[PDB]
Design a protein around this ligand. Structure first.
Ligand SMILES: *[B]([O])([O])[C]1[C][C][C]N1C(=O)[C]([N]C(=O)[C]([C])[N])[C]([C])[C][C]
Ligand SMILES: *[B]([O])([O])[C]1[C][C][C]N1C(=O)[C]([N]C(=O)[C]([C])[N])[C]([C])[C][C]
Lengths: 659, 659
């Protein structure tokens, strides 16, 4: 992004993209918005079924399903205005959605055959009882709360009772009188919500619940249906997050059938992906697992027997793309070439050697065709803005677009972590018009938390580094330990001790900066958002002689006030780890603020609740220290859209005023 | 304040004060804390009855009534920990208070005679139904909600149904999860709360309500009992606030008896004081009124006939102190000598000439003895820090304490208002070490709203001006039109047009500043709190070429979000005055912010709700302008106590950084 070839994707055996008013098909044909409009009763659509080229069009009056290969309307759907929770049946003729707390199924209507009223699956949804939506704070790969069986006979869905969770107020300041709504945000160490899984059987209109049993707090993750629809598999994770049991439940009655396998960890287990069945098989599936230190693909049968670890090595699978039609090969993205890069690979289901299908050094983003016969590859590197190719697998490529190259120079390299052994990768955005004779102020842009990696081999953070460098400030970033795509041992060093290693590694970044002659060692600043706001603030309080100025956005300040699921994975529960929580609790060290720090929060932030930065200002008042503040009353966790211009101006002016 | 002679006051025919461990009596005797302690079953006390020297002591285990003239314990009271709402019977042997939403009366227990359970006057108090407390947002002189009859036979009290008022959330951020409480703050133009007056008769335990009738929104103010306890008088003010009817109600049945008199005004009527009966009379009383342009004392009889305007002139009575024993003279404080000064006077009840009893130029604060025979006077002026005298009236004074005089020079003078006719008084705090050869930045400290007057002839704002001047910044203040103690016409020019005249007068202040050679006209700032925060912000947006930097604390930003009672008096209702509200609505002009402005708010401010400054930051985001912010999460409208040091440091550093 930015997208040079709009909507580039597979439809049947054609790759497809938009060109203003046309939709262009190739294996060439065009389809105009006028051609299309004539068929209604180039616009935006959601692809439902790439293999069959079925999409849905969001229009003036409900949804219009459309077949792009046949060039024919499929169904019109009426979801009473609901679009966010839309989940279409794999059969393509029904859609589940949530409206006013309850789960519904709507049936599509064929062109001029009249409509039917939607079915209410649930009727007692409310504030404290949530149906059909993501649960467990969207941890464990959970992004939604509806799971159609693969032949469309059944709809599994979450039911979340959060009546035992003490809510946080989220205040809307726009009405005449401000209006508060409870957010049922379960904080570390507190009673969790109670999720159960229902299955609604369309033929009979019966609902059964899985008998997942006790404890009621157990995390029910990665729902995966058997291809024959008889079993619903669930990866269940305990409160300690050190055990994951993959269990089979009977879809008809809800009864527990068997435990397939159990994974455990010294620190935490974290399942993130569903079971994926082999093509044409009801008995074998791929499961992703980081159990050996590295995310890899495992071949299981459905009794729970492990056939083979299919991928292996000191590198990680970062996206599983699927199979060849016969199910004899796996396709996937990984870090095998470099953790700074992403390539697409093939491997035999029997394992052994990977074959890189996108060998150019840099970042490949790749889409395997419904065939399993070809790929779209989108490529960028420090020297290549965008290279979009289409390859018939092992039959030569065809380039579809290639982009050609005063701006800030970007330098990259490696420094040693604080253990003196682990290498860390860094990027350094140099002042515009950099003159090596001169001294320059510099800003550490830090994130440093799990699941993110900021330094990759890409077409050279959303460009805040560039803007700052245009103002004469170098910006440095290093992926310290805790960060992603470097295997588990590299990440899990932070367990029970948030901030400690991360800061020690960032101070290696500062040691490097200070080795540079052109760095003004007395003008070093720090900026980050979220976990990076936690880090910015911790760094100013911990290394006040070094960091003169920071801006911390949406910062975690007190981890006891972060959510149970993410928080307790990396930190354990507060009652189990008082020493670690206390060391990371920035409220306790507010008196050590001696530089200039601005905190920024969205007022309606439901991720890092506003309370975090407010209590920090409060602690500073008592401690007699002097931070600055800005609040975005209409924003949540991140400032999004045009208002991001105001954000960038506020942050950079703070630095140009004070650093 | 600071208090040089601690607790200085009348007790019987003695004036009294504390000296560490003694309470010293004079007309000399001492009473030690050890003498006192021996009598319990020099400390802090509340005087209940100065004439009889009866006080109450707040102790470890309930309240102890004590007679200071007799040196004997009166009663012990058990009010289950409640102290804020305490209202003692004039008989001295019972106390009303509010606990858990309900009104109670407790009977005092004589030393070693055992206690009795308190009487519950009400039992259905809750969140939306308030008993025994101030109502109508404490406007109209209302400071409490209990009114004992003067012989203690009855207790009148307010009942406020606020179930029709849409509340504002007030959030406590200190618990693990933040906790919101509704504040039933009725905003301009919205449905007001419904107040009725109950009277509880102690002999029978019966409660009757006054039949105050419709509209239910009417303001019931300045409750005043007849000395014979048969009638309860109420000053009733309509929603428009341009009519006040003083009505008599039968205390026994609640029935309406008669309207005594009606006052009306072109702009607003504002009754602020109770009826005060002549000594020994049930038929004549003094009523304060600003009806002729100036606050004066009127002599009425109880049918409603006006006997005489007793005081008159182009000056205002600022405190009515009472009568001589015979009720032939009035004692009171006024502005007759100068609006910049306060003197104590005598006048014949027949009127005519005032006699100044405290003729020295400056500020006198005066207490008339229970006799009506003598005064304590506390005096300060620009040259006199503190002069404390005691005069036997018209029989020569006795001085009791006289205080003796690098610091910022304070200059004072007069400039013309923007009409070119009305004089305005100003004070100017000069930089420390002021050098007339030099140029200095200067800050307008502005308040500018009704009911306040910042420039008086005093021992030279809580000293923020001095601190700023120590940092090299001159501070200027001018009492613009709208401000207090200059009669109604001077105030009421702002009616329906908040900010407009006030700003035009403050810009005369700036014209004066710019006439000074030692003023750096390019380094002019502005600071104020509350109405002064409204003014600071309006000035920056209205005169952005002049005011480079401001700090606005607890600012009103949108008057539609200010309370019905204060707001609609000066502005009328929003539906009646859209042009005036729109002109004062700072949200509409956020795009005109071109200087540096910090807003500061207490998060739990129940006067100017936090929403005001938050919506201003929000409007600035949209408008692309760049204010700064600080929030005090544990503070209400003003930052109080030691945290005020943090406040002063934040505000002054903002100026030293940017102005
Ligand atoms: B942030 O860094 O954006 C925020 C605070 C620390 C972790 N975090 C997250 O947003 C994580 N998500 C969740 O906590 C979800 C909402 N449970 C991110 C980084 C994904 C792991
Ligand atoms: B402030 O100036 O402290 C605030 C905003 C404008 C008026 N105001 C007040 O505090 C007034 N009191 C009330 O509004 C009461 C609470 N109804 C003061 C100035 C007394 C008139």
């Amino acid at each position: 992004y930015p997208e040079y070839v709009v909507g580039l994707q597979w439809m049947g055996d054609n790759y497809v993209f938009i060109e203003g008013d046309d939709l262009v098909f190739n294996k060439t044909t065009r389809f105009s918005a006028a051609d299309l409009n004539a068929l209604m009763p180039f616009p935006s659509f959601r692809t439902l079924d790439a293999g069959r080229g079925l999409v849905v069009l969001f229009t003036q009056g409900g949804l219009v399903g459309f077949d792009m290969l046949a060039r024919k309307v499929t169904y019109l759907f009426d979801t009473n205005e609901e679009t966010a929770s839309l989940d279409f049946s794999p059969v393509g003729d029904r859609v589940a959605y949530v409206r006013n707390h309850n789960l519904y199924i709507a049936r599509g209507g064929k062109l001029g055959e009249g409509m039917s009223r939607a079915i209410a699956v649930t009727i007692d949804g409310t504030e404290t009882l949530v149906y059909g939506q993501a649960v467990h704070q969207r941890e464990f790969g959970i992004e939604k709360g509806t799971f159609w069986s693969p032949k469309g006979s059944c709809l599994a869905f979450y039911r979340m009772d959060q009546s035992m969770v003490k809510p946080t107020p989220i205040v809307d300041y726009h009405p005449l009188e401000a209006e508060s709504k409870p957010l049922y945000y379960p904080m570390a160490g507190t009673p969790s919500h109670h999720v159960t899984v229902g299955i609604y059987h369309l033929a009979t209109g019966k609902t059964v619940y899985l008998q997942t049993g006790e404890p009621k707090e157990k995390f029910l993750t990665n729902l995966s249906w058997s291809p024959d629809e008889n079993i619903l598999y669930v990866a269940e994770v305990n409160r300690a997050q050190n055990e994951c049991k993959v269990n089979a439940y009977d879809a008809e009655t809800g009864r527990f059938v068997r435990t397939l396998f159990v994974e455990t960890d010294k620190h935490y287990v974290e399942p993130l992906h569903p079971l994926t069945f082999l093509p044409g098989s009801n008995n074998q599936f791929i499961w992703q697992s980081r159990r050996d230190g590295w995310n890899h693909l495992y071949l299981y049968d459905t009794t729970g027997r492990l056939i083979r670890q299919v991928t292996k090595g000191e590198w990680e699978v970062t996206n599983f793309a699927g199979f060849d039609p016969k199910g004899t090969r796996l396709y996937f993205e990984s870090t095998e070439a470099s953790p700074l890069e992403r390539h697409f690979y093939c491997i035999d289901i029997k394992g052994g050697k990977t074959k890189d299908l996108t060998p150019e050094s840099g970042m490949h983003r790749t889409q395997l065709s419904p065939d399993g016969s070809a790929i779209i590859d989108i490529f960028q590197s420090p020297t290549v803005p965008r290279k979009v190719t289409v390859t018939n697998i092992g039959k030569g490529s065809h380039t579809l677009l290639e982009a050609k190259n005063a701006m800030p120079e970007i330098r990259t390299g490696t420094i040693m972590a604080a253990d003196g052994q682990t290498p860390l990768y860094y990027k350094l955005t140099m002042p515009l018009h950099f003159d090596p004779a001169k001294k320059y102020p510099v800003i550490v842009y830090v994130y440093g938390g799990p699941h993110a990696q900021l330094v990759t081999k890409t077409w050279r953070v959303g460009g805040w580094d560039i803007y700052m460098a245009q103002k004469g400030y170098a910006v440095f970033t290093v992926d310290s330990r805790g960060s992603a795509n470097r295997g588990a041992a590299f990440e899990q060093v932070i367990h029970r001790r948030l901030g400690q290693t991360e800061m020690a590694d960032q101070m290696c970044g500062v040691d490097f900066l200070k080795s540079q002659s052109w760095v003004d060692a007395d003008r070093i600043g720090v900026h980050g958002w979220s976990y990076g706001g936690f880090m910015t603030t911790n760094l100013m309080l911990t290394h006040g002689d070094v960091f003169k100025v920071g801006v911390a956005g949406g910062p975690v300040i007190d981890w006891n006030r972060y959510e149970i699921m993410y928080g307790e994975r990396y930190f354990d529960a507060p009652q189990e780890n008082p020493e670690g929580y206390d060391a990371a609790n920035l409220l306790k060290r507010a008196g050590d603020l001696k530089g200039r720090l601005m905190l920024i929060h969205g007022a309606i932030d439901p991720v890092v609740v506003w309370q975090h930065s407010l209590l920090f200002l409060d602690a500073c008042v008592k401690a007699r220290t002097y931070p600055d503040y800005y609040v975005y009353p209409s924003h949540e966790h991140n400032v999004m859209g045009p208002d991001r211009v105001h954000l960038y101006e506020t942050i950079t002016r703070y630095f140009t005023d004070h650093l």
